[PDB]
Design a protein around this ligand. Structure first.
Ligand SMILES: *[C@@H]1O[C@H](CO)[C@@H](O[C@@H]2O[C@H](CO)[C@@H](O[C@@H]3O[C@H](CO)[C@@H](O)[C@H](O[C@H]4O[C@H](CO)[C@@H](O)[C@H](O)[C@@H]4O)[C@@H]3O)[C@H](O)[C@H]2NC(C)=O)[C@H](O)[C@H]1NC(C)=O
Ligand SMILES: *[C@@H]1O[C@H](CO)[C@@H](O[C@@H]2O[C@H](CO)[C@@H](O)[C@H](O)[C@H]2NC(C)=O)[C@H](O)[C@H]1NC(C)=O
Ligand SMILES: *[C@@H]1O[C@H](CO)[C@@H](O[C@@H]2O[C@H](CO)[C@@H](O)[C@H](O)[C@H]2NC(C)=O)[C@H](O)[C@H]1NC(C)=O
Ligand code: NAG
Ligand code: NAG
Ligand code: NAG
Ligand code: NAG
Ligand code: NAG
Lengths: 49, 579, 599, 214, 220
């Protein structure tokens, strides 16, 4: 796909168990895959209801 | 560029002799009239060329009782009619019979409000030739026209160039243009018959192109060359974050254009309007002035004529003289009419007495005009206003004058504190005993290029000189408000305080002084007079050469205070051993 | 109408979870109050539910997904109040699989008319067609905005011939409609026809069906009962000839883009506008029901949207020192306690939360999603008296308490009202004492649809275990087990604590009633037995004087050497313990009214 | 403008000892002279007025006198708490004028410093700079000689030092010398050392550390 | 006694202006002579100006004539000094004082003073670089640990340990001016070597002028 894993330093980006990965894009673009109960760009917030 | 209009209607001029000069000073070089344009009671061979610059009139245009053949308003494009002459007339031409033959209003393409009244002008040729329907703006208007065709004049047909036989005069340049009745579609104004000739909706008198930057004149509002519906707000609102923000591009609204700041004598506001009035529940605050909201109960406000309960009052009388007691600033005008000093058998109101006028002794500022056409013969001057510093002229008499003195017996003005005439003309006439008019530095009182003094029938300069009546010899530049050393504008020597003197009592005299900015101020009472030398350097007890009694370091003392101290052998106060 | 999202490119859960989340949020949404973010959506997703979206407040972000079309046929206006990367209102990126099995082919934004702010960025879309067949400058309002349309398609077909070279797709139904670039010179805006007389109103956002301010799709500024206006009707009318300002009998306040007759009770009024907080040089002042901005106090800002702080944290919390009123929201997120290594931010010492014990007012929402494990309450906010609700979480909730594993009670004992918003309390497995609370006494207005207190400790067990509030408390409940946490006491209160009785007729510390609160009697007041000791704490409100009487006042003794308006005052006691003035020739006191009685 | 010359500018006496500070007026100002005392970190406070009179609230330890244009401030029993700068000011003319000011030190025995050395922090090195610190604690007099010799390379022009105020109990001073290096200047060196001598030190002391060992 | 509180200090650039004030309580300033005195770093006391509100007369030192204007508000019971056309040499702590009493003309009433810094330099929050203890910071049975505060402006910066809990054995060294135009400050504490790694040692550096607070734990 278009995705690669984050570096050990970059992995710090995601919180609350969010999985950090990057888009293969001159600037770095961080994405997280949040647990079902988490949301926000870094998985910092809980999902309501 | 911008000047105010007048408010005379068909009233006679106070001074027929200076009436023409008045108009010139008021209108010369003006493009926009912030007021009504009134040209009345003119003589023949009048120098009216100063009117050629006018393009817009915010109010109505009145031309009446003139013997002149023509009035050079060829550049006039709009009569906005904010105020209308009589029965909703924007333009009125009355009794100009000498008399007008041509209108010559070549550029006039728009009237926004009101109709046209042309009557009894027995020379005028083209009052019934103009297609007034085109001139009237698209918007619903009374648009009543009363056209008197009893000209009793053999007039030439419009130039061959004037297709449709519509003209303002006999020349080809006088041919009337049509901006509305010739438009395609529903366009309010056009350059021509095509859709491509339509003017921007914000255009008024017409356009040179399709853009709001191409307008000949603006319909709603002129923003630095661009016709727009509103002036940019000083403070805007963010509808997404629910927050107000400062607007770098915000401007103040003055009349019908944006300004970066309000013109002199106008107040700024937080809504962004320039006003001559500070709205209710606010205060006038200096910095330059602005009108600020009251956060706490507003301060006492003194009012003059034209304001509040005095709006319908013509003059100050014994019935209302007391209302100015304790006032320093009067919001409104003052007027002293024959009826003020005479009695009124109808209302049974007493005449003002000399001792009652003293209520104005504390007066420093008038926001309106000062009109004095009567004055007690026991008062040789207007010194009751000696402490008057500023006349703003926000309200003008006849819409023109901020200071008028007529038919008075005063020998001198005596208004020594008067330093500013914020706006308006000054008129001093028929004061046959009044000398000290030309002795006043009027150019130092005026602020606007459009201000001037008009005068006539005052005491002859030759008579003043013949009797040796002039400014004091110590008076700088010979500029004074009266013959006394106390009435001088500036002193060539020392001011002392309120009297020009040769010197301060520094080296000689019992009541010794010191020099401070050319003023003569007293030495501290505890100070010892120095014969042939400088008694003191200031008013404080520590600024003297020697003590009159003895020292109480650093200050001179008469007797020691009770730390109880006593005068010791040192010649100074020391703490006492007895307690 | 719905809240939008703000996750950027990040997603929650797997493809299905993300789809269902998108579905539920926009299921019947016409206006997105935020951004529209579609990322990592599969080709099996049915996105037809987005068909009802007409307006997007923020940006439109579509990236790294695979589906044939983006079904937003009714989208007309993108406001761009939020701009992705700070540059473009619309993003279309990488919408294809690297195995070329699936890709985005069409946008079909056939009704898109105007983008009020931001540019357009369409890049790296191997099979995305008809992107260079759009006259993007017809749509983008900002002439200075960047428009990027580059690597999009290779073998893509031409537009239908009726499209005249401009289309959002291959069909005739996909033809682009131009609204600006085809206008008369006189318009300088969008039109609904080629004629000079067919230009849309200046305040119109997107296209229109006529020349009037009521014929427009959407407003650029304010909506005044159907009309699009540059501003709501101003309080003063300006006279251009006389330079006067006259009262305007018909005014409306600017509120969130709509003109209203009056400002909401929980918003401060700036000069004609309802604002979340006043400008930096102004302070809030209480008037007649309303609060007004006036020409200041400590600008103690909150967290959340409109602030640089996402949470109270180890580097943020010190800002609340000596804070009594928070100008904003207050988020406590997990990272605000555990720390945030991404920014080199250390964990927050839990006891630094005590800084909030001085805060009485929060103008925004209170959002607690994490709370120190040794704390069983939010008593740290016991001083809280009100929640403004001027800003709301997910544009709905003013009070949020979630997943506080060890919290049993709420606290906020001084809390009297919540002026706006919804209340969400859930997943608080230990929270017990909230069950009996009557929210209609706290939350203003109707509450039936605004209360969500589900999925917390079961009431059955809360009560069965005896975890109930002191029974002396009245209907309305408590914020916790104690009488000091009671909303309203059955009898009296002392110090705000629910008590059985006051010491009126007995008790050493004799009291009197005031508003059902027990107040002590004056120190010099004689204790009564069987009747009330006093009717106040004043020296003249006691039934009897315990000592000496000086006129109307009970005193411990008759005064000597007191300075009044007449100089030094000396009085002596009578046999009745009433005080009387000493002889005028007395020294420092007397034993009587006579000269010979002088000391 | 009356000038006031104050002397000595520095005195030293043991606790309980008698100390006199004098000032000479350029003019006869009678008794219009006041003495003020400024403690470290504090505003000047009044002690004596009218040449000799004690101001209420002022310790009885102070009194003054006058002879001609010479004024004296006397303390009968110097305390550690009296470590301050004293000023003679005239209040006879305007402006009021001050003398240079006098300081009084508490006399005690001479003692060597306790010497130790610090390395730069790791966070500092990562910042592109380095600070190496050598500190002399609890010594008297305040005069001391501190030399930086990194790998026996004497440093100069790249260091600053500061001296603390007199200790209120032990009447001692401390001296801290900081050597400034760039990250590059730090890396090129291995053994950092500080050589210290003092009047109360019978044998010179050198402290050192190795880069990477801390 | 009486209370005198100076304010209005801070950082101003040369050619600019700064307005000092001093609130009084316990007496009516109207009846006394109000003085300002300034002390440049490393210098003695320089008399600046006085106002005597009773009659409104003022006097100035030659060093400030034409630039400084002194006044007071007897309704606010507060003194003011308007200093215009300030230059770098005007850096000083400015004290307020009053001549309490009628025949008493000495400065018995004093405030604390406020620092006025005049400099083209902008403000700068401190960088704190914690100095770990080690076998090389050990002397006898005790060992030093400390923190260095580098490149901050203007002075002063406030430094304490453990939020003021640790003051014993603490030695703070007066600021020096660096070639950067910024200031440097240092503070150390000497503790039993057995406490290292056991007792919390956090250096708390507070620089008001830049709204900067830096907390550094000092350890191996
Ligand atoms: C909106 O408001 C702006 C701001 O006032 C206004 O711009 C102004 O337009 C007037 C013309 O009406 C300009 O006045 C001219 O300035 C030039 C400068 O060189 C002069 O040469 C012009 O002189 C003519 O008229 C004289 C008559 O006495 C002739 O003798 C001479 O030969 C020329 O024919 C004339 O003074 C004015 O300078 C500008 N101002 C600015 C800042 O540009 C704009 O026109 C208004 N638009 C609308 C729709 O109202
Ligand atoms: C301006 O606001 C008015 C409401 O005050 C809008 O009118 C409503 O539009 C919705 C759309 O579905 C209708 O259901 C309502 O019945 C309408 N109300 C009324 C009174 O007509 C109007 O459309 C808005 N206009 C703009 C440009 O935003
Ligand atoms: C919760 O609060 C509501 C509103 O205060 C209470 O409903 C009111 O009860 C009183 C009792 O006399 C009635 O007079 C009011 O008319 C009721 N208001 C409404 C809107 O119906 C409700 O009873 C309270 N419930 C509890 C448990 O205290
Ligand atoms: C004046 O004009 C009016 C217009 O109707 C006309 O009726 C009247 O007879 C005219 N008067 C003269 C003297 O021509
Ligand atoms: C008088 O004229 C002199 C000329 O320099 C000026 O300095 C002075 O201020 C003037 N005095 C007054 C009262 O205007
Ligand atoms: C203000 O902050 C100081 C900081 O020490 C604190 O001591 C004081 O009590 C606070 N004032 C309050 C809470 O009103
Ligand atoms: C709140 O939690 C603290 C934590 O120690 C506890 O001591 C206190 O009693 C609790 N308050 C209530 C009402 O439970
Ligand atoms: C705020 O905290 C103080 C702390 O002493 C307390 O006395 C006061 O009653 C509290 N205010 C409220 C509303 O609880």
């Amino acid at each position: 796909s278009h995705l690669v894993k984050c570096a050990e330093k970059e992995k710090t980006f995601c919180v609350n168990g969010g999985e950090c990965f990057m888009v293969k894009s001159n600037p770095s673009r961080y994405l997280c895959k949040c647990p079902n109960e988490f949301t926000g760009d870094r998985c910092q917030n809980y999902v309501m209801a | 560029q911008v000047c105010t209009g007048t408010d005379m209607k068909l009233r006679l001029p106070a001074s027929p002799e200076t009436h023409l000069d008045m108009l010139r000073h008021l209108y010369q070089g003006c493009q926009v009239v912030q007021g009504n344009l009134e040209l009345t009671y003119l003589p023949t061979n009048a120098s009216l060329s100063f009117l050629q610059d006018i393009q817009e009139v915010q109010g109505y245009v009145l031309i009446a009782h003139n013997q002149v053949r023509q009035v050079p308003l060829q550049r006039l494009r709009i009569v906005r009619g904010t105020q209308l002459f009589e029965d909703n007339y924007a333009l009125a031409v009355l009794d100009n019979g000498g008399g007008l033959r041509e209108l010559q209003l070549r550029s006039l393409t728009e009237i926004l409000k009101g109709g046209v009244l042309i009557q009894r002008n027995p020379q005028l040729c083209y009052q019934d030739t103009i297609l007034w329907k085109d001139i009237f703006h698209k918007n619903n208007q009374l648009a009543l026209t009363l056209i008197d065709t009893n000209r009793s004049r053999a007039c030439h047909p419009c130039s061959p160039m004037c297709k449709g036989s519509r003209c303002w005069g006999e020349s080809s340049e006088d041919c009337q243009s049509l901006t509305r009745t010739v438009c395609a579609g529903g366009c309010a104004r056009c350059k021509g018959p095509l859709p491509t000739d339509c003017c921007h909706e914000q255009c008024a008198a017409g356009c040179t192109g399709p853009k709001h930057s191409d307008c000949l004149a603006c319909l709603h509002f002129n923003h630095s060359g661009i016709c727009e519906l509103h002036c940019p707000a000083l403070v805007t609102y963010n509808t997404d974050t629910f927050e107000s923000m400062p607007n770098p591009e915000g401007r103040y609204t003055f009349g019908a254009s944006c300004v970066t700041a309000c013109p002199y004598n106008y107040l700024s506001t937080d809504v962004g309007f320039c006003t001559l009035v500070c709205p209710l529940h606010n205060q006038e605050v200096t910095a330059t002035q602005r009108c600020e909201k009251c956060s706490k109960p507003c301060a006492r406000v003194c009012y003059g004529l034209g304001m509040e309960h005095l709006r319908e009052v013509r003059a100050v009388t014994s019935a209302n003289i007391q209302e100015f007691a304790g006032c320093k600033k009067i919001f409104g005008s003052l007027a002293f009419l024959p009826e003020s000093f005479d009695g009124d058998p109808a209302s049974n109101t007493a005449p003002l007495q000399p001792e009652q006028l003293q209520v104005f002794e504390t007066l420093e500022e008038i926001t309106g005009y000062l009109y004095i056409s009567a004055w007690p013969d026991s008062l040789p001057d207007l010194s009751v206003f000696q402490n008057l510093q500023v006349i703003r002229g926000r309200i003008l008499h006849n819409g023109a004058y901020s200071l008028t003195l007529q038919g008075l017996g005063i020998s001198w003005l005596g208004l020594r504190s008067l330093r500013e005439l914020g706006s308006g003309l000054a008129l001093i006439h028929h004061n046959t005993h009044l000398c000290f008019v030309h002795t006043v530095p009027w150019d130092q009182l005026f602020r606007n290029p459009h201000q001037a003094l008009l005068h006539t029938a005052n005491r002859p300069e030759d008579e003043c000189v013949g009797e040796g009546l002039a400014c004091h010899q110590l008076c700088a530049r010979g500029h004074c408000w009266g013959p006394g050393p106390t009435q001088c504008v500036n002193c060539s020597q020392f001011l002392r305080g309120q009297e020009c003197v040769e010197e301060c009592r520094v080296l000689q005299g019992l009541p010794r002084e010191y020099v401070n900015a050319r003023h003569c101020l007293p030495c501290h009472p505890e100070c010892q007079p120095q014969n042939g030398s400088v008694t003191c350097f200031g008013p404080e007890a520590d600024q003297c050469v020697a003590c009159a009694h003895y020292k109480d370091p650093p200050f001179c003392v008469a007797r020691c205070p009770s730390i109880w101290k006593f005068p010791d052998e040192e010649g100074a106060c020391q703490p006492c051993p007895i307690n | 109408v719905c809240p939008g999202t703000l996750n950027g490119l990040s997603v929650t859960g797997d493809a299905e979870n993300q789809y269902q989340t998108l579905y539920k949020l926009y299921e019947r949404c016409e206006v997105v109050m935020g951004n529209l973010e579609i990322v990592l959506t599969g080709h099996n997703a049915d996105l037809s539910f987005l068909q009802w979206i007409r307006e997007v407040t923020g940006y439109v972000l579509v990236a790294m997904n695979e589906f044939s079309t983006l079904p937003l046929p009714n989208l007309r206006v993108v406001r761009g109040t939020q701009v992705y990367d700070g540059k473009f209102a619309i993003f279309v990126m990488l919408n294809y699989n690297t195995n070329s099995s699936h890709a985005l082919r069409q946008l079909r934004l056939t009704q898109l008319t105007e983008i009020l702010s931001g540019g357009v960025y369409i890049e790296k879309n191997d099979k995305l067609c008809h992107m260079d067949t759009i006259d993007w400058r017809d749509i983008v309002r900002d002439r200075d905005a960047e428009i990027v349309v580059k690597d999009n398609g290779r073998s893509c077909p031409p537009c239908h011939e009726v499209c005249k070279g401009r289309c959002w797709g291959p069909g005739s139904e996909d033809c682009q409609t131009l609204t600006k670039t085809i206008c008369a010179p006189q318009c300088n805006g969008h039109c609904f026809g080629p004629n000079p007389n067919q230009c849309c109103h200046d305040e119109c956002a997107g296209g229109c069906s006529g020349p009037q301010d009521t014929d427009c799709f959407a407003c650029r500024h304010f909506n005044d009962s159907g009309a699009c206006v540059p501003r709501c009707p101003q309080p003063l009318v300006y006279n251009k000839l006389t330079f006067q300002l006259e009262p305007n009998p018909h005014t409306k306040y600017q509120y969130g883009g709509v003109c209203v007759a009056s400002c909401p009770h929980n918003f401060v009024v700036d000069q004609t506008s309802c604002v979340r907080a006043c400008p930096p040089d102004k302070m809030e002042v209480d008037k007649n029901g309303l609060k007004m901005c006036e020409p200041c106090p400590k600008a103690c800002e909150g967290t959340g949207s409109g602030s640089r702080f996402q949470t109270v944290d180890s580097s943020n919390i010190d800002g609340f020192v000596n804070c009594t009123k928070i100008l904003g929201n207050l988020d406590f997120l997990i990272t605000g306690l555990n720390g945030d290594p991404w920014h080199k931010i250390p964990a927050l010492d839990p006891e630094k939360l005590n800084v909030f014990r001085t805060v009485r007012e929060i103008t925004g929402y209170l959002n607690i999603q994490s709370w120190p494990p040794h704390m069983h309450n939010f008593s740290v906010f016991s001083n809280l008296t009100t929640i403004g609700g001027r800003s709301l979480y997910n544009r709905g909730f003013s009070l949020l308490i979630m997943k506080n594993l060890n919290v049993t009670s709420l606290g906020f004992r001084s809390l009297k009202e919540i002026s706006a918003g919804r209340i969400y309390i859930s997943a608080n497995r230990q929270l017990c004492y909230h069950h009996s609370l009557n929210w209609t006494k706290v939350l203003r207005g109707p509450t039936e649809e605004r209360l969500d207190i589900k999925h917390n400790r079961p009431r059955r067990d809360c009560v069965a275990e005896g975890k109930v509030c002191d029974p002396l408390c009245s209907s309305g409940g408590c914020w916790g087990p104690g009488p000091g946490q009671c909303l309203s006491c059955r009898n009296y209160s002392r110090g705000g604590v629910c008590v059985t009785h006051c010491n009126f007729l007995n008790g050493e510390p004799r009291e009197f009633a005031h508003e059902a609160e027990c107040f002590s009697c004056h120190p010099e007041c004689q204790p009564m037995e069987g009747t009330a000791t006093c009717n106040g704490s004043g020296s003249d409100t006691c039934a009897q004087c315990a000592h000496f009487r000086d006129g109307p006042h009970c005193v411990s003794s008759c005064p000597h050497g007191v300075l009044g308006a007449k100089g030094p005052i000396y009085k002596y006691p009578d046999v009745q313990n009433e005080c009387r003035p000493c002889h005028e020739n007395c020294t420092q006191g007397c034993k009587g009214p006579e000269l010979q009685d002088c000391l | 403008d009356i000038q006031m010359t104050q002397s000595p500018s520095s005195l030293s006496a043991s606790v309980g000892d008698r100390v006199t500070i004098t000032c000479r007026a350029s003019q006869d100002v009678n008794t219009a002279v006041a003495w003020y005392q400024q403690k470290p970190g504090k505003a000047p406070k009044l002690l004596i007025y009218s040449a000799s009179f004690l101001y209420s609230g002022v310790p009885s330890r102070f009194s003054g006198s006058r002879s001609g244009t010479d004024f004296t401030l006397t303390i009968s029993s110097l305390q550690p708490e009296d470590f301050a700068t004293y000023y003679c000011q005239q209040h006879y003319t305007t402006p009021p004028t001050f003398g240079q000011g006098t300081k009084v030190e508490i006399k005690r025995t001479v003692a060597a410093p306790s010497v130790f050395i610090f390395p730069p922090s790791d966070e500092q090195l990562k910042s592109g700079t380095a600070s190496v610190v050598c500190l002399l604690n609890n010594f008297y007099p305040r005069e001391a000689k501190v030399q930086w010799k990194v790998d026996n390379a004497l440093q100069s022009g790249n260091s600053q030092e500061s001296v603390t105020e007199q200790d209120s109990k032990d009447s001692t001073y401390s001296l801290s010398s900081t050597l400034t290096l760039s990250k590059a200047d730090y890396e090129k060196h291995k053994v950092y050392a500080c050589e210290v001598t003092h009047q109360g030190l019978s044998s010179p002391v050198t402290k050192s550390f190795n880069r990477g060992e801390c | 006694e009486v209370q005198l509180v100076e304010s209005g200090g801070g950082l101003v650039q040369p050619g600019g202006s700064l307005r000092l004030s001093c609130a009084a309580s316990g007496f009516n300033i109207k009846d006394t002579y109000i003085h300002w005195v300034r002390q440049a770093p490393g210098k003695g006391l320089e008399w600046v100006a006085r106002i005597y509100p009773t009659n409104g007369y003022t006097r100035y030192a030659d060093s400030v004539k034409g630039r400084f204007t002194i006044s007071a508000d007897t309704s606010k019971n507060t003194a003011y000094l308007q200093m215009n056309s300030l230059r770098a040499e005007d850096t000083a702590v400015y004290y307020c004082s009053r001549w309490g009493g009628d025949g008493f003309y000495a400065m018995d009433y004093w405030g604390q003073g406020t620092l006025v810094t005049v400099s083209s330099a902008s403000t700068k929050g401190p960088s704190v670089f914690p100095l770990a203890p080690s076998s090389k910071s050990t002397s006898g049975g005790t060992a030093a640990l400390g923190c260095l505060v580098k490149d901050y402006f203007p002075e002063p910066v406030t430094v304490s340990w453990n939020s003021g809990a640790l003051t014993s054995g603490v030695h703070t060294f007066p600021a020096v001016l660096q070639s950067s135009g910024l200031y440097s400050l240092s503070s150390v504490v000497t503790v039993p070597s057995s406490s290292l790694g056991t007792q919390t040692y956090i250096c708390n550096v507070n620089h008001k002028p830049s709204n900067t607070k830096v907390d550094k734990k000092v350890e191996p």
